């Protein structure tokens, strides 16, 4: 057993300087520091995993305090390897600067 | 202090650009920033190339400045710069860099096993040497 996701940071939302589009998040992925290396990650699942006070169900498991918002990498962003991600619900702004899992599926390799 | 010089015949390793990883010979110096280089035996057309994308090697060919390609190719073969380059530690380090880059997942597993046993054998030997060093002082 071991890790099976890549470490990404929730850098922020899509925005100009005075307008913020919260339906799209900008992810900084560890080791991806150019636009030419982001190709592997496009379309990959993304999981914002967090914990809450109340228990919740678990697929193939018993209830616990872990919750997740799913998403996926939709496209690259800029020249330094950021990717745009969309989630089934907009990420809460308390999640800026925290971990966003990037899975290794759907696999194209 | 300096040892390697930009001069007619100096063989330079191209580090980045369209011809990265290849050897060229400085055929002429255009100005402060560019040189006319040639790669007859390494697949580089005679062209202008900035010094920034060059790293000087220790090899110097002997041909006149601006001598046409027939003679840059001729001097390259006489000196066998191709086998001399692959004999340098510099070439081997480049080779070691890409052998590692192409390691398949199974290969990585086999290195992790081999490294595991090699490291233990060396460590156990290092321990014995240290103990013997204790007796000599004592």
């Amino acid at each position: 057993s071991g890790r099976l996701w890549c470490k990404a940071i929730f850098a922020g939302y899509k925005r100009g300087l005075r307008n913020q589009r919260e339906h799209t998040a900008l992810l900084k992925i560890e080791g991806v520091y150019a636009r030419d290396e982001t190709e592997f990650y496009l379309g990959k699942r993304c999981a914002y995993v967090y914990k809450a006070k109340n228990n919740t169900v678990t697929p193939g498991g018993k209830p616990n305090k872990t919750r997740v918002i799913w998403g996926k990498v939709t496209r690259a962003h800029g020249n330094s390897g950021m990717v745009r991600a969309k989630f089934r619900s907009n990420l809460p702004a308390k999640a800026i600067g925290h971990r966003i899992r990037v899975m290794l599926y759907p696999s194209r390799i | 202090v300096f040892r390697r010089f930009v001069e007619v015949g100096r063989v330079a390793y191209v580090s980045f650009g369209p011809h990265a990883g290849k050897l060229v010979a400085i055929v002429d110096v255009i100005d402060q920033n560019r040189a006319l280089v040639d790669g007859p035996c390494t697949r580089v057309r005679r062209q202008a190339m900035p010094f920034k994308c060059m790293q000087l090697t220790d090899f110097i060919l002997k041909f006149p400045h601006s001598a046409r390609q027939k003679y840059v190719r001729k001097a390259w073969e006489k000196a066998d710069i191709n086998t001399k380059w692959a004999a340098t530690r510099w070439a081997k380090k480049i080779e070691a860099r890409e052998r590692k880059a192409k390691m398949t997942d199974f290969d990585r597993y086999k290195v992790m096993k081999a490294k595991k046993m090699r490291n233990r054998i060396i460590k156990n030997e290092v321990k014995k040497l240290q103990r013997a060093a204790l007796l000599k002082a004592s």
Binding site: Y33 | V1, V8, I30, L36, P64, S66
Partner: protein
């Protein structure tokens, strides 16, 4: 005119439109250095208009075509005669450059005239471009490269890959 990218050399031939008085007007030819042919044609009309009672309406372009460098693998010295408008007058200049192509030497002139005299390309008129033998070149910057045994090192090489890695354990070396 904008000196965008590397300029090209164009051969532009034009004439007055034929009329009953002069059914066969003479053909005028100019050397035009421009980004693209559309700009090349426009500049042609800007120059012949200065030298002849001619403009686009009363004349036509007979031929526009790039002039390829004849010895692109040879190193040459180019003398450029140009006039340009400064903030307080017009001045004729003569400048020298080393290149492989004549158009490359003219492009060096536009960057150079912009750098040293804050001259925008709309105020520069290249009058003449001549390849010059090493013995006739005047500018010491060009002449110092006329040394069959030229040799020089590359001191204090500055690390240009400064963000790969962005954080490193070892300080860069500048001596090679």
């Amino acid at each position: 005119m904008k000196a965008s990218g590397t300029l090209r050399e164009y051969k532009v031939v034009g004439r007055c439109l034929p009329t009953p008085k002069c059914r066969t007007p003479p053909l005028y030819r100019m050397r035009i250095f421009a980004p693209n042919h559309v700009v090349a044609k426009s500049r042609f009309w800007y120059f012949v208009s200065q030298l002849k009672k001619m403009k686009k309406s009363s004349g036509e372009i007979v031929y526009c075509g790039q002039v390829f460098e004849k010895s692109p693998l040879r190193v040459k010295n180019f003398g450029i005669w140009l006039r340009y408008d400064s903030r307080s007058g017009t001045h004729n200049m003569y400048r020298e450059y080393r290149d492989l192509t004549t158009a490359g030497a003219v492009t060096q002139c536009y960057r150079d005239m912009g750098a040293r005299h804050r001259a925008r390309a709309h105020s520069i008129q290249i009058m003449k471009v001549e390849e010059i033998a090493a013995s006739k070149c005047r500018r010491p910057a060009v002449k110092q490269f006329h040394d069959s045994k030229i040799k020089f090192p590359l001191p204090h090489r500055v690390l240009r890959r400064q963000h790969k890695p962005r954080f490193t354990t070892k300080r860069p070396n500048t001596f090679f």
